[PDB]
Symmetry: none
Subunit: 132 residues, 2 copies
């Protein structure tokens, strides 16, 4: 019966070993499944990382080239704004020139009517000084 | 008895078979744990690199849309100033024709007045020749 003790402690050791191997097999498969999933993903993530980087660096060139074009339009704004202000001032001045000249034409017509009046009085004066 | 010692021998046999198979399994587990830890280290380094690269790419995409639209409005403002300088120039060219016509009238008026003086002085001299004849 110390006999049976021995065979029973042996057989219980075997059950614990079978339980241990089965548990370790469950752990083995669970890790395998996760590891596999993660390496699928790793490979996907790497291709996509290379694609994002290339496209990011490409858009950097695009940004810089269109910022340049934007700048060059901002300067033609400045140029065309000054041109328009200046056509406006040259127009405004030619209009005042027109105004001046109309006023100079009126004053002058007045002076020359005064001079015909003047000359009419001298003509009359000359007539009254004549020696019959 | 020898029956009991043979049962025990067969049990020990199984214990060894299973323990050895256990050790074989642990070696495979340690190897795969190492591969797995390494793959998970790389994955997390690449995922955040992916995160910042894609954020910057998306950000630059918005910048592109914004700037393309801004360049159309800049061009619009160039069109507003072109129009204004064309309309101010045609206004000016019409006024410059009035300036030119008026300057001729003023010249002509200075001449009318100057010849009036002359005609009056000649006429005064003829009235004098009449008086004296």
């Amino acid at each position: 019966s110390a006999d049976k003790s021995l065979q029973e402690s042996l057989q219980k050791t075997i059950y614990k070993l079978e339980e241990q191997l089965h548990n370790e097999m469950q752990l083995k498969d669970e890790m395998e499944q996760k590891c596999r999933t993660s390496n699928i993903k790793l490979d996907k993530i790497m291709k996509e990382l290379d694609e994002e980087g290339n496209q990011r660096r490409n858009l950097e060139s695009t940004v810089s080239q269109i910022e340049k074009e934007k700048m060059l339009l901002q300067h033609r704004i400045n140029e065309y704004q000054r041109k328009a202000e200046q056509e406006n001032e040259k127009r405004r001045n030619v209009e005042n020139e027109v105004s001046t000249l109309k006023d100079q034409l009126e004053d002058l017509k007045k002076v020359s009517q005064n001079s015909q009046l003047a000359n009419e009085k001298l003509s009359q004066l000359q007539k009254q000084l004549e020696e019959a």
